[model samples]
Target: HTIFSSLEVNGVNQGLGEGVRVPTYNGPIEDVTSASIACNGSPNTVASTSKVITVQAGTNVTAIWRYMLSTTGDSPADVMDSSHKGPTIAYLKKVDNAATASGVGNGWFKIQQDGMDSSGVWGTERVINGKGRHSIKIPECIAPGQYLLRAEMIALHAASNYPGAQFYMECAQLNVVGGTGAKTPSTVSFPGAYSGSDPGVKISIYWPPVTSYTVPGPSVFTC
Candidate 1:
């Protein structure tokens, strides 16, 4: 129902409500002003125009969303949907040459993640119904380079059925500056990283009381 309209690094918005510049698997560049692409499976090889955001390593950034309204002149709401609650995660993949890269490949490592909290509320729920902005911190020791920053949220409202959970994600071009030569963490490919049957990816969030939830992905790479 909603797609990330722009990204905010530090405190500046990259393209607020202008239209998503990052390439998505199913989001057409033309419909970016209105719809969000929803995927129920692995990666679909695609790339959008490279719109790089310069960010200093080890700093915090935010992702802003624009929820389109059926009525005109209304403000966009926070949270994708009440039923679309689940984990929110971010990942990064170093790019050798951002100008020539297709924005799809391997070497993606988890950078930040938030899921179900101790109180049984999903992380997605806590940030909903207001300004749709999620914050993330870059690893302090990452090697400086061109990278693709991927932000994703798994909507589990329909998790009761197989492959019913939807994945909403997009990749942004980034030019990370200032690395202290820290070792990169283990990486995984997008399509290779997720299977439709993973417990975290496929489960009934409503049944058995979801007091705890495991975020699906590799461990977060730390500085």
Candidate 2:
């Protein structure tokens, strides 16, 4: 159980919830059909941050996650539980209002997805080892606008069965600037994008020991 509490823009750490829609619980979202699958809103409406983070296109934004919604983290172990092992992914959706747009909306495109390394090391392990600093660069070509950046991680400890993969995510409000607006990536819906039956979602990572991993969600969009 973990929560993405803060953002580091170009290596500058913004405080907790400074530009993020903080989720209430640090638990797994099981149902792939739930609307919350998109922007992570289900049992409780997430608290939105008033201050939208402003960053230039092609810049790096690192999401800092903490276990049990802790305000601070000291060790790499505090980022995530070792049992939770899978991929870390992120998506971006252009919206009219980053501050008020419902995560239920469409037009979301995958921006980044980190799966397994050459040694079959899951990306989630890197987050735990790096003290929760997961960074990816914003595309330089997507149009500059108000967008909700959805950051996610998956746990596959129980994924050998159907619907056993646990999804954890939070949205960070963003105001992108200095974009060339050259490419508009194809979009996909959250709940529709991932089916619980997908090979990646339902797999025996524990027993069969997948030599290679197929990351869930669409392919990562590039500049």
Candidate 3:
């Protein structure tokens, strides 16, 4: 069970669920095409909050994961169970009003992704090591606007078989400021971005000890 329960902007911790649309339960979504894969939870189950965090383009925002939305992952292992291992990713979707937007469909571009290290450690492992802080930088060249920041961490402990991987995520509302608007990043839809059979989504990191791993989803959009 995992949840991207809170967020930190430029090293400052935002209160739990301050700008995040958190789901009711800390559970995994196994279906790759489910709408919940977008920003987590069906419309009714995704809890709402009106506050939108202000972010400056080119700054780092840290996505903090916890076992529950009710508390900070202050303890050493409250971020997620240790067996959960895989990639960590973040995406941004420009929208009319971040506070009111529905994150179930199109218009998302990958902002950052951390997959595996040469030492064979997974990105999710490092996030736990850092106390669940998965920091990603907003592109300096993107247009300034209201956006949804979707942060996800995949657990592949059981990914050797289909339907075994766990997708955990949450969408944080953000108003991005001070950008050059120099790039129109290619976008991808959430439910359409992944497949159950994708190599990265269906892998066994434990058995043979994978030598290398490919991250799922589109190539990360860069400035």
lDDT of each: 0.65, 0.86, 0.88
Query: Best lDDT goes to which candidate?
Result: 3
lDDT winner between candidates 1 and 2:
2
Query: Order of candidates by lDDT, top first?
Result: 3, 2, 1
lDDT of 3 at 213: 92
Write the residue-wise lDDT of candidate 1 on 6-55 in tens digits: 77876777764222343333321211111232211233333355566888
The Cα error of candidate 2 at residue 156, in Å, is 0.6
> Which stretches of model 1 miss by more than 4 angstroms?
17-47, 69-79
Q: Over all chains combined, what TM-score does candidate 1 have?
A: 0.82
The best-first sequence of candidates by TM-score reads 2, 3, 1
TM-score of candidate 2 to 2 decimals:
0.96
C-alpha positional error of residue 123 in candidate 2 after TM-score superposition, expressed in Å: 0.5
Total clashing residue pairs per candidate? 1, 0, 0
Assess candidate 3 and give its TM-score to the true structure. 0.96
Candidate 3, residues 113-198, lDDT tens digits: the string is 98988998889988887887888999999999999999999999999999999998889999999999998998999899999899
Question: Candidate 2 vs. truth: CA RMSD?
Answer: 1.2
